[PDB]
Every structure is written in C-alpha cells, then in structure tokens.
Amino acid sequence: THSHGLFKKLGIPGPTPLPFLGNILSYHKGFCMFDMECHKKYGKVWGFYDGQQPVLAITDPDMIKTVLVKECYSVFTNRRPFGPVGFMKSAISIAEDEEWKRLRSLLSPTFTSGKLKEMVPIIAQYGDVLVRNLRREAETGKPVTLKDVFGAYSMDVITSTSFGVNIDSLNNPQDPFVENTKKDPFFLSITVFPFLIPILEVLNICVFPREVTNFLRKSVKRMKESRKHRVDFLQLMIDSQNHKALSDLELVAQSIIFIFAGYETTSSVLSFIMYELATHPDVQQKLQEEIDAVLPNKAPPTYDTVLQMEYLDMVVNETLRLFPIAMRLERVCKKDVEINGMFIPKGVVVMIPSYALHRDPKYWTEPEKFLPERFSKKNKDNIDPYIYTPFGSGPRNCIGMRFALMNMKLALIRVLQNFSFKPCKETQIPLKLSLGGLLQPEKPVVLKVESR
C-alpha cells in the first residue's frame, strides 16, 4: 500500500484497494462492468488502483474535453506505458511526447479524404470477394461464423491497402502473409509486477511474436527494393521519407499497428453490426431499402455514395455506442495540474470510461436498447460529443476513423445488397460480452444467411 492512500488524501471516493493487488480483483466481472458499478456508486469522479498505479475516472463532459483536447499537448499527451514492447515503442499509438508528435504529423496525410477516395476501388474488389465467400456458405444452408468471413475480408483489405499483397485469405489457408498476419494470465501479472517489464525487455522477450516481426521487416525491404505504382500505406510512407524523416525500422512499427487496427477492430464491429441487424429485421429491411434507393440495381458503392446513406451511418453509430471496442480512453497526467475545479497530481492515469458513458441513463433513453433513431439528423444534436466517443477525441483520437467507417460501410453495402441475415438455433440471444479484457462476444456470432 505504497501509493494506495492518494485518493482518500484528495477526498476522491473509490473502491478500497488491497495491498500489492490494488483493485484488480474487482476485474472479475470485466473492465466495463467494474466501470459501470463505480459510476453508479461513486458518481461523476472516482479512483482506483491497478496494482500500485492510481487511476482516476472522469465522466464530466467539460473535464473530458479539457483532458482530451484543451490540455492534450501540455498535460495529457501519452497513454499508460504497457508491458515488454521492444522495437514497437516506435509505434504511433505507443510513442510519447515529441516522438509521437513527429509520427502523428508524418502519418496524418496518409488518412486524408484524398488518399481515402483513392482506396475505394481497392477495398471494393474484396467486397465482391466477400460476396463470393458468402454465396458459398449461404448455399451451405447452415449457420455462418461472421468473425471468420469478416476477419478474412478485414485481413484482405488491410494487406492490400498497406502492402499491395492481394490474397484470398479464407480460400488461401497459407500465403505466408495470411499466416504471419493471422497471428490474460500475463497482462494481469505485468500489472501486479510492473517492475518486471525492464527484465523482459533486456531478455528481448517481446510480447509480439518475435517469430513474425522479422518476416515483415524483410518483406517491407523487399517491397522497398522491388518498387505502375501505387496507392498502399507503405507507398505513402515511402514517399514521405523522400520534422525529421522516418526510419526503416520505424516504418515496420507503424505497419504492424495498422494491421492490428485494421483487422480485429474492423471485423469485430462488423460482427456486432450484423448481430443487431439480424436481431432487428425491421432495421435490416430499412437499411436494405436505403441501399437499393441510393444504389439502384445492386450498383457498386462509391466514396460519394457511402457518405450519402444516413440510415447506414445511423446503424454504424448506434452499434459503436453499444460496443465501443476501445472501452476506455486513457491519458497520463504529466504534471501537477488543476482542471475544471479539481487538482490532478503527476503520474495519475486519467481514464474516460467510454463503455459506461455510452450506457448511462443520464444521457441515453433505454441504454440497453439498440435504437438507430438516436443518431437521426433530428436527435443527433442532443448527443454530447464527449459522452459518445467511439473513436476518442482531440489531437490523439483514432487516426483511421474515416478509413474504418468507409471500410466497414463498403462491406455492409455489398453484403446487404445480396443477402439477409437471420438468427439460428446456434445464435446466442441476447449476446453476452466476453468476460476478459477484450470487447468481443462471449460466443462467436453465428447467423443464418439467405440470398436475396
């Protein structure tokens, strides 16, 4: 109990921490359940301890605005340091202070709307590939695992948009990439034993499978040498090094982040969306009518076409409210500060419980209900942008927010143009969330697929 007396010294409520462990035993219900219990019990501000690390949760939109936007460069610049990282410390989502600001500025032009519209014809090709794989498992006439067909699509999209490697992941069990790209009782121990991280670093024990990273460092340098080109993420970073220019090892670190970003997140949300569309056939029918109205006759989706669909944007936003895959937003307090009326000491991790704020009765009518009409152009104005934060906010929000929304909507249009999705006897209704550290279904979502 070295630092376990900080929150009661500041008059901040919270759960009573145990020695060494802190409040990590309260994670037996999960990250999200623990935050909703504390928010319902302690109010707008409370504190807890991840081992010996003090964490302060805030729910006031003005205070959230000050942390994420106002005092981002001055006070709340970085996220919590995590376990044996290794060379991936040069990744943008992990880098800190000026090292991050240099990487953020070197990668911001990559995600502009100009580069994004140039990627529409690429990620539309795999939308047709996704329809092909779905047409097979539909005539199979038995429940289909969504995270597999969506995971393949998300893997095909991210490898083509970042390396130009066009594969059929579901039908090619092992093109090298597919396998290497296809690749807790340890993070909990790291949280209770944070002093062991320097030991794992000097032992080169990288959490990343060290038996994979080298495969990309040579694959990238092969593509560097071998390079009618081109519109992939690698090229936009190759043309950038032509602040201070990037490094070749820094180049590989950002490539790995975009994959874990463009894979698990895209496929998970797409699975949550299709679960809600299957469990609400009225919403699925209305969405298919808007798709057929904007794209008559199964016309191919375009950049300007995707942005025109309002109900599609309403369906995506509502699923992200129920399932914000990040769960929490976190910032480290770099110095003794005093924001919006309260004093924040140095070293405290300021956390925004995004999952709990998205299901708070103070801001949402029937929080557990899936109601896309919350985000209609009539009701969207009564939604605080610092309560609904699926992509974060401020200078360090999701840099691939526009790419994620465009990639998911392009798949949703091509999928719903040809198929309807019904629950199966195997479908878990209602959907239970994973008890662990990730925001994923307890049971993988399986649904019945029928051709239109």
Contact pick of 399, 406, 411, 439 for ligand HEM (by CB under 6 A): 399
The alpha helices in 144-263, defined as continuous H runs, are 146-163, 176-182, 187-192, 197-202, 210-226, 233-238, 248-260
Nearer to a second copy, 5 or 198 (CB): 198
List the single partner that 92 binds among ligand HEM, a second copy, none, CB under 5 to 8 Å by kind. Answer: ligand HEM
Pull the structure tokens for residue 332: 């480290």
Question: Is 333 flagged in the annotation as binding?
Answer: no
State yes or no: residue 96 binds a second copy (CB under 8 A). Answer: no
In whole angstroms, how close is the CB of 116 to ligand HEM at the nearest point?
11
Tell me, what amino acid is at 335?
K
Nearer to a second copy, 195 or 225 (CB): 195
List the single partner that 223 binds among a second copy, ligand HEM, none, CB under 5 to 8 Å by kind. Answer: none
List the single partner that 61 binds among ligand HEM, a second copy, none, CB under 5 to 8 Å by kind. Answer: none
List the single partner that 336 binds among ligand HEM, a second copy, none, CB under 5 to 8 Å by kind. Answer: a second copy
In whole angstroms, how close is the CB of 342 to a second copy at the nearest point?
17
Q: Is 165 exposed, middle or buried (0-12, 13-18, 19+ CB in 10 A)?
A: middle
List the single partner that 199 binds among ligand HEM, a second copy, none, CB under 5 to 8 Å by kind. Answer: a second copy
Distance CA(253)–CA(227), nearest Å, equals 20
Binding segment toward a second copy, per CB under 8 A, in 163-171, 173-181, 196-204, 386-394: 196-204
Nearer to a second copy, 60 or 99 (CB): 99
Contact pick of 265, 284, 288, 420 for ligand HEM (by CB under 6 A): 265
DSSP 450: E
In whole angstroms, how close is the CB of 289 to ligand HEM at the nearest point?
25
Binding segment toward ligand HEM, per CB under 6 A, in 119-127, 322-330, 373-381, 432-440: 322-330
Residues ≥6 apart with Cβ < 8 Å to 234: 162, 163, 164, 220, 223, 251, 255
Distance CA(84)–CA(310), nearest Å, equals 43
Pull the structure tokens for residue 106: 């070197």
List the single partner that 391 binds among ligand HEM, a second copy, none, CB under 5 to 8 Å by kind. Answer: ligand HEM
List the single partner that 59 binds among ligand HEM, a second copy, none, CB under 5 to 8 Å by kind. Answer: none
Specify the DSSP element, H or E, that contains 166: none
Contact pick of 150, 258, 386, 421 for ligand HEM (by CB under 6 A): 258
Distance CA(142)–CA(358), nearest Å, equals 34
State yes or no: residue 400 binds ligand HEM (CB under 6 A). Answer: yes
Residues ≥6 apart with Cβ < 8 Å to 295: 301, 305, 413, 417
State yes or no: residue 18 binds ligand HEM (CB under 6 A). Answer: no
* Binding to a second copy, residues 231-260 (CB under 8 A): 244
Pull the structure tokens for residue 191: 């949280």
Distance CA(174)–CA(166), nearest Å, equals 13
List the single partner that 397 binds among a second copy, ligand HEM, none, CB under 5 to 8 Å by kind. Answer: ligand HEM
Distance CA(237)–CA(188), nearest Å, equals 35
In whole angstroms, how close is the CB of 331 to ligand HEM at the nearest point?
7
Task: Tally Cβ neighbours within 10 Å of residue 154.
Answer: 28
Nearer to ligand HEM, 52 or 93 (CB): 93
Contact pick of 104, 115, 135, 334 for ligand HEM (by CB under 6 A): 104
Radius of gyration of the chain (CA): 22
Contact pick of 175, 179, 201, 330 for a second copy (by CB under 8 A): 201
Contact 169, 156 (CB under 8 A): yes
State yes or no: residue 19 binds a second copy (CB under 8 A). Answer: no
Buried b (16+ CB within 10 A) or exposed e, 250-284: bbbbbbbbbbebbbbbbbbbbbbbbbbbbbbeebb
Determine the distance from the C-alpha atom of residue 13 to the mean position of all C-alpha atoms in its chain, rounded to a whole number: 30
Distance CA(267)–CA(415), nearest Å, equals 13
Could you tell me the CA-to-CA distances from 413 to 270, 421, 431 in Å, in that order?
A: 12, 13, 24
* Binding to ligand HEM, residues 336-395 (CB under 6 A): 390-394
* Binding to a second copy, residues 350-409 (CB under 8 A): none
State yes or no: residue 92 binds ligand HEM (CB under 6 A). Answer: yes
Binding residues: 398
Binding residues (CB under 8 A) for a second copy: these are 2, 52, 98, 194-196, 198-199, 201-202, 244, 335-336
Binding residues (CB under 6 A) for ligand HEM: these are 68, 92-93, 104, 257-258, 261-262, 265-266, 269, 325-326, 329, 390-394, 396-400, 403-404
Binding residues for heme: 398
